[PDB]
Amino acid sequence: DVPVNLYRPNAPFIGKVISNEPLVKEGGIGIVQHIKFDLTGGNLKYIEGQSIGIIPPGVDKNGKPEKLRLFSIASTRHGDDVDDKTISLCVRQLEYKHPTVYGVCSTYLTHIEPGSEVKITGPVGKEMLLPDDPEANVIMLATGTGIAPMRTYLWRMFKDAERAANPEYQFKGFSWLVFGVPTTPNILYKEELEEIQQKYPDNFRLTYAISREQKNPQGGRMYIQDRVAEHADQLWQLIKNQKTHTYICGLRGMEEGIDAALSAAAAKEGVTWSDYQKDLKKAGRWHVETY
Ligand SMILES: Cc1cc2nc3c(=O)[nH]c(=O)nc-3n(C[C@H](O)[C@H](O)[C@H](O)COP(=O)(O)OP(=O)(O)OC[C@H]3O[C@@H](n4cnc5c(N)ncnc54)[C@H](O)[C@@H]3O)c2cc1C
């Protein structure tokens, strides 16, 4: 049922870049690009929450061909134009200290020109799939590029064109995105996210943790864990619903604080969060993808 590995590293799909647009507005930190690829000519299909591999050109420091890097799909199964012909990624340029270094695949992607051919593999992953049940509740805890699978979910749920194309999925549950980025300009897809909340105030809640513009009660910069702590009781109450799914995505590091906050909330009703969570993971309702 779920498509997987229609293309593999030994014989990847050669797609063409259609467009490559900036998601970080002026005054933001770093570079994050929305890149859309043409899938026509092959049979690459995918669903929300999956990933694809991109094989960058060139060789590594040892002269070995570069290997694929995985990127979370940022478009629904239908693509951004709802035509079933494309796929999009949300790619941050990796750059860092000394160990000024630019990540190989991410720099290649963020600077890639439309018309360029790209080696694509996948799709892969069954850990971040959205439930078919339209009355499910969906909690989304994302930082930076972790917004990507969340975009696939929220677009499928809330875009007019998606609703028209998906007769079998008219979402009527409640979705809540807690999104941590350093600055307002760094809020990826800000305009569309807020548009979704204005149109579906009863079905979508949007919460930001903006570290350079907000302080937590302890006076430190505001991070996603802080927002989870702030709304821990509410989040725990939603999670107790048999139909609630929680999704965590972004660079590793946020899970510890999220657990600590949810643990304190659950403890109030005599529940051991770490145990409850184990059962949620077994049931396929606690979805994590960090990197
Ligand atoms: C399931 C999954 C989903 C992903 N989704 C996304 C996504 O949606 N968007 C996205 O941008 N990326 C995503 N990634 C990460 C992506 O796959 C690449 O790992 C990332 O883009 C960097 O790859 P690169 O080739 O550009 O860097 P590389 O040239 O491969 O360099 C990576 C290496 O740099 C070193 N390094 C990294 N950070 C530091 C640091 N700060 N200080 C010192 N050394 C460091 C480490 O050795 C690391 O192994 C995802 C990864 C996985 C596994």
Side-chain angles (χ1 to χ4, degrees), residues 154-155 157-164 170-171 191-206:
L154 292 166
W155 268 223
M157 293 165 179
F158 295 123
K159 285 288 187 169
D160 288 337
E162 288 285 330
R163 289 186 170 259
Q170 307 292 115
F171 182 75
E191 284 74 4
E192 293 170 275
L193 291 171
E194 295 179 349
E195 171 174 11
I196 291 173
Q197 181 175 233
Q198 292 300 83
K199 173 158 190 190
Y200 291 100
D202 299 325
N203 303 104
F204 179 53
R205 180 174 183 176
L206 176 55

Side-chain angles (χ1 to χ4, degrees), residues 68-94:
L68 68 87
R69 275 74 154 163
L70 291 182
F71 297 92
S72 318
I73 298 170
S75 55
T76 73
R77 67 189 61 190
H78 301 303
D80 291 338
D81 311 296
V82 193
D83 56 12
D84 297 327
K85 297 188 174 192
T86 81
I87 191 164
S88 299
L89 293 179
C90 178
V91 182
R92 185 175 70 87
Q93 167 165 272
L94 176 66

Side-chain angles (χ1 to χ4, degrees), residues 1-290:
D1 188 61
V2 178
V4 65
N5 302 314
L6 288 159
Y7 293 85
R8 306 178 178 270
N10 66 297
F13 175 68
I14 309 314
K16 254 181 207 295
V17 177
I18 290 166
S19 65
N20 175 173
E21 306 292 338
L23 290 171
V24 179
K25 308 299 179 179
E26 51 195 24
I29 297 166
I31 288 160
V32 186
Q33 306 288 121
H34 193 76
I35 311 163
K36 190 164 70 185
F37 308 87
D38 196 349
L39 296 184
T40 58
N43 64 348
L44 191 299
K45 296 192 175 159
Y46 59 99
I47 60 172
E48 301 76 18
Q50 296 191 296
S51 296
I52 51 164
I54 296 293
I55 299 167
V59 297
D60 64 22
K61 65 162 61 183
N62 306 306
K64 285 293 317 291
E66 292 280 351
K67 295 170 176 308
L68 68 87
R69 275 74 154 163
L70 291 182
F71 297 92
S72 318
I73 298 170
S75 55
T76 73
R77 67 189 61 190
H78 301 303
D80 291 338
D81 311 296
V82 193
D83 56 12
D84 297 327
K85 297 188 174 192
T86 81
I87 191 164
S88 299
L89 293 179
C90 178
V91 182
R92 185 175 70 87
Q93 167 165 272
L94 176 66
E95 43 177 335
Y96 61 85
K97 50 185 185 286
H98 290 269
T100 279
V101 177
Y102 294 105
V104 166
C105 191
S106 66
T107 295
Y108 161 68
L109 285 165
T110 60
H111 293 68
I112 204 168
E113 293 292 328
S116 294
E117 297 182 340
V118 175
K119 290 180 170 59
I120 298 170
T121 65
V124 309
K126 306 191 180 176
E127 154 75 334
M128 300 287 288
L129 300 182
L130 196 62
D132 284 324
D133 190 330
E135 321 212 281
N137 298 139
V138 179
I139 296 163
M140 297 164 194
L141 306 174
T143 62
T145 52
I147 188 76
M150 316 313 182
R151 186 175 182 275
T152 77
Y153 312 145
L154 292 166
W155 268 223
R156 174 169 169 80
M157 293 165 179
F158 295 123
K159 285 288 187 169
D160 288 337
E162 288 285 330
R163 289 186 170 259
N166 311 319
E168 85 289 356
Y169 189 72
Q170 307 292 115
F171 182 75
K172 56 171 106 81
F174 175 66
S175 283
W176 188 353
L177 168 71
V178 186
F179 189 20
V181 296
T183 74
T184 288
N186 274 96
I187 296 166
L188 311 177
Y189 314 107
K190 187 187 78 191
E191 284 74 4
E192 293 170 275
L193 291 171
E194 295 179 349
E195 171 174 11
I196 291 173
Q197 181 175 233
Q198 292 300 83
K199 173 158 190 190
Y200 291 100
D202 299 325
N203 303 104
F204 179 53
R205 180 174 183 176
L206 176 55
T207 302
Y208 296 129
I210 310 162
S211 63
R212 306 297 174 97
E213 308 168 13
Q214 303 171 330
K215 304 292 183 191
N216 61 41
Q218 296 74 225
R221 286 176 172 165
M222 183 80 73
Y223 298 103
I224 184 184
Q225 298 100 320
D226 298 308
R227 290 297 194 200
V228 171
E230 179 185 351
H231 299 285
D233 288 339
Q234 290 161 105
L235 290 162
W236 166 245
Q237 297 161 12
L238 292 178
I239 290 171
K240 292 189 291 175
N241 189 328
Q242 65 176 255
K243 293 201 184 191
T244 294
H245 280 74
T246 305
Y247 297 80
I248 299 188
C249 191
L251 294 165
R252 300 181 191 96
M254 81 278 269
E255 297 178 72
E256 157 175 315
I258 289 162
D259 285 336
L262 288 177
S263 183
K268 281 172 188 163
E269 308 182 333
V271 168
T272 303
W273 169 239
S274 57
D275 295 339
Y276 196 91
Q277 181 179 234
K278 275 197 189 58
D279 284 343
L280 291 181
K281 182 162 186 180
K282 263 83 290 178
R285 300 200 277 120
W286 188 261
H287 307 87
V288 182
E289 179 189 290
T290 55

